[PDB]
């Protein structure tokens, strides 16, 4: 008996930004979804498609863990069918996404003096993003009709922008850690089940 390492992606020491969010698939273990809901340390535990209490019986063939840090007033944008500058340029959920999302506040680890400018998000982009797709790039977004040669000036700007993750901010500006669990069901039999 080998329990699934869901506490590895949850109690990690180095999370990722929203434009370069990490992803690794968990397989060949028995899941323990009871202690996650009964942990009493999370803020928003909502599902989309599956009942949140019916996880331990109806099982899936592969699970994905997408971990990234966003603001407090933008955790609603990670939901099936929402708009906003985070939901369309960094991370988009489709309509048929049959998984559960889970978020919690991370103020006691990602808020120090001086300001945390390491967490970066994408503000400018050419078009919207397809669901479940990341775009690591440093290409200058040409906003006006001037072709600039990768320089910083008028009508073309840098696409990334740092976060003001200072501990003196309001409760809506605190950095929030969110993990996306995507239960995908194939015609092949399941592997993580229990």
């Amino acid at each position: 008996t080998n329990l699934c390492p869901f506490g590895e992606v949850f109690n990690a020491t180095r999370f990722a930004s929203v434009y370069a969010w990490n992803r690794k698939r968990i397989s060949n273990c028995v899941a323990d979804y009871s202690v996650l809901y009964n942990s009493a340390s999370f803020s928003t535990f909502k599902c989309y498609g599956v009942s949140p209490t019916k996880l331990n019986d109806l099982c899936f063939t592969n699970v994905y863990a997408d971990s990234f840090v966003i603001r407090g007033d933008e955790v609603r944008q990670i939901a099936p069918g929402q708009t906003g500058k985070i939901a369309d340029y960094n991370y988009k959920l489709p309509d048929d996404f049959t998984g559960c999302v889970i978020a919690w506040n991370s103020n006691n680890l990602d808020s120090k003096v001086g300001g945390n400018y390491n967490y970066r998000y994408r503000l400018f982009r050419k078009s919207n993003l397809k669901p479940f797709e990341r775009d690591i790039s440093t290409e200058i977004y040409q906003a006006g009709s001037k072709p600039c040669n990768g320089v910083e000036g008028f009508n073309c700007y840098f696409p990334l922008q740092s976060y003001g993750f200072q501990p003196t901010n309001g409760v809506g500006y605190q950095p929030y850690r969110v993990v996306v669990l995507s239960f995908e069901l194939l015609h092949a039999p399941a592997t993580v089940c229990g």
Partner: antibody
Amino acid sequence: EVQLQQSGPELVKPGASVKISCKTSGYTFTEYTMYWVKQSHGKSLEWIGGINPNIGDTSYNQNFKGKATLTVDRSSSTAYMELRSLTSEDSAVYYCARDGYPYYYALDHWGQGTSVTVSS
Amino acid sequence: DIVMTQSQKFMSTSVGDRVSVTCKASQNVGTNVAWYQQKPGQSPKALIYSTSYRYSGVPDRFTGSGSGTDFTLTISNVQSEDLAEYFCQQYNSYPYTFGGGTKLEIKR
């Protein structure tokens, strides 16, 4: 229908300051970049500067640095140009524009023009 | 900055005639130039952008060619509505430098 409506003609004394408006309707005002120009009587055209409504970045001409400033009012979708230290050389018309880069263009899409004359 | 020179300033072509409006650049502008049309008293409207493409609502007889230094706005079948003021702009380096201007006339 995309429509740019400007103000009326203003008679002004030398040394004063005016505010020329260009109301916008029919498109998304936040993304598209707005330019401002100046056409003197009988001579060639000249460019002043451009302002970006989503950010606020400005890049004026070097001959109009201490001449004109630009402010954008997103609450009513109205841009403004404020001219300072007017002399007799500013007997010109002033147009507003609109960039067109997210439509595969190089468009300016000029407005109407405000005839601003100077006299004592 | 870029000095956009137009020569000459006056041109006289009758109706049903081919006319060519040219203007030069100082440095390597590339491809991104423009052309406009200004009725006397009215506001200027856009005709040609990036020296190969028209706009939405302009006639198809306004064609353009040339790259690098020389640019030409050639009109095939001119009309009475063709009489206007034609300018040329660049989009290479800020600030934008407009041209001089060329006025059309009817031969008599």
